[PDB]
Amino acid sequence: NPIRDIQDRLKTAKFDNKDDMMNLASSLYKYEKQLMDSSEATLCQQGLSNRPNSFSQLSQFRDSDQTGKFWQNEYEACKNFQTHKERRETLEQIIRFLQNGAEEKDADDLLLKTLARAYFHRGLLYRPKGFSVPARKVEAMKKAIAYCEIILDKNEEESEALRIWLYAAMELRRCGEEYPENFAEKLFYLANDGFISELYDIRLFLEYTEREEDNNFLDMILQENQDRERLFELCLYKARAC
Amino acid sequence: AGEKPVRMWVKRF
Amino acid sequence: EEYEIPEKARIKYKELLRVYNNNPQAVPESVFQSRVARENVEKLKSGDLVYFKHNEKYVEDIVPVRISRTVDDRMIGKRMSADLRPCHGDWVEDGDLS
RNA sequence: UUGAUGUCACGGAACCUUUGUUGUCUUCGACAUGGGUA
Ligand SMILES: [Zn+2]
Numbered sequence: 001n002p003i004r005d006i007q008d009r010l011k012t013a014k015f016d017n018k019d020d021m022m023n024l025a026s027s028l029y030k031y032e033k034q035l036m037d038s039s040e041a042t043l044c045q046q047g048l049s050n051r052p053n054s055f056s057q058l059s060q061f062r063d064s065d066q067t068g069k070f071w072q073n074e075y076e077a078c079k080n081f082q083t084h085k086e087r088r089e090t091l092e093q094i095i096r097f098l099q100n101g102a103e104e105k106d107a108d109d110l111l112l113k114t115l116a117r118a119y120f121h122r123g124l125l126y127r128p129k130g131f132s133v134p135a136r137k138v139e140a141m142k143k144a145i146a147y148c149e150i151i152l153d154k155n156e157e158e159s160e161a162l163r164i165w166l167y168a169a170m171e172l173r174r175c176g177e178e179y180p181e182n183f184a185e186k187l188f189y190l191a192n193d194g195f196i197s198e199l200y201d202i203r204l205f206l207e208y209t210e211r212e213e214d215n216n217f218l219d220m221i222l223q224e225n226q227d228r229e230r231l232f233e234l235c236l237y238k239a240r241a242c
Numbered sequence: 243a244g245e246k247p248v249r250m251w252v253k254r255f
Numbered sequence: 256e257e258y259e260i261p262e263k264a265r266i267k268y269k270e271l272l273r274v275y276n277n278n279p280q281a282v283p284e285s286v287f288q289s290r291v292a293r294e295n296v297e298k299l300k301s302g303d304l305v306y307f308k309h310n311e312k313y314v315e316d317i318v319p320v321r322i323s324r325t326v327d328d329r330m331i332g333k334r335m336s337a338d339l340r341p342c343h344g345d346w347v348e349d350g351d352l353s
Numbered sequence: 354u355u356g357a358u359g360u361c362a363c364g365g366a367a368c369c370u371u372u373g374u375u376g377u378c379u380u381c382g383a384c385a386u387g388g389g390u391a
Contacts, residue, residue: 045342052348059350243290244304255391280385289387322387343376 001044002031010048010057015064022069024061029070033097067101068110075114084125091122102147109151109158116147116164123171133175141168145180152186162190166204184211195220199233206240258309260317263349265299267326268317272296274324291319 009024034041048054071094078090098115101107123140145168151161169183191208195217202224205217221241224234275291285293299305299317306323308316316325332340332347346352 051346055348055350055352243302245302278385282386287386320387 001046002027002034002041003044003046003048006031007048007054010054013057013061015060021061021064022066025066026070026073028061029067033093037093066108066110067098068108068114071098071114072110075118078118078121088122088125091118091125094118095122107150109154109161112147112151113160113164116144116151116161116168119144119147120164120168120171123168138172138175138177141172141175144168157189157193159190159193162186162193163196163201163204166190167200170203170207187211191217197224199228199230199237202234202237206237258307258314259312260314263328264314264317267328268299269297271318271324271326272298274326275319289320 005027006024009020009027013020013024015021074090075094078087078094081087081090095115095118098111098118101111102115119140123137123144126134126137126140128134145165148161148165148168151158152165155161165186166183169180169186173179187204187208190204191212191214195205196202197220202221205221208214209217218241222238224238226234228234272291275289276295276297278292281292282288290296296319306318306321307314318324330347332345340347
């Protein structure tokens, strides 16, 4: 029960504490979201016990009052769904709920990172219905770039925002579109950040090498462990490095 | 209605 | 020696005012009605002469005349079991849900 | 405010998806009033 979760959060909640206030907001956010969906949880017709105390705690919370952390955990649930139908639907809900926060001037970077990453992942799931590349896939990859550029203007070397910007830029190339204007500059900054031992990031460093002829990242690529699931990708990456 | 206080003679027993 | 007026006593007095005004058995002649009923008093203002009941520092009840009405300090919802109240109902506690 | 020996843009349906629904007997008996007396 979402209501039972809220009631438990109210029993042990310190408003100066940040761990409790994050759990209480999570229970409140989850209960509201299940209401908007006409899910079977809406059949819970009970209320909160200890009304005078529940009212005071809820009233203090609203005066004391993160959106980013609740929705970040909702996205991490998407990445574990087996079917593309399951992932495509949940990405639909995340995008529509986080659109309001993106418009706000005082928008948390965690909210913007989650929304840009949700646009990128939804862009990968657009099924073609013709000879042309889907126009929605191009728009999704461009929206993800726009959100990341909001973060990148404040901090030109944000580690995750650069990666999401570079992920969407590569998929624009795969769709026949050219690279964005600052693709050379954004790619240089990730090289300054260091080296990431992830297959989906190694290809970004190979693009850096082909444009800057810098050999520092190549030996790191050739030392990768070969116990990973997508072994064909790593063999191709090492052949490019060799 | 007591807007202006008034002095009066009172007798008690 | 002065005593404090809590928000409870003001609400009881404001309930008392509308009972005087909305009296279906009130005399037709406004001259025979009380000052509260005749002038249609709707709030307690400064300089008003009343009869008050106090305990220790705080006041309890306020009446305009010597013999008047005793307004209950609870809503009638508190005078029945909380289980017998409507499953979805109204707020009878202190403070406003607004 | 064009450029010219080359424009199918009348080459492209703002299209697709969501019950104004839910809950309530046109019902009915005890008062009203503030002092007065000492
Ligand atoms: Zn009921």
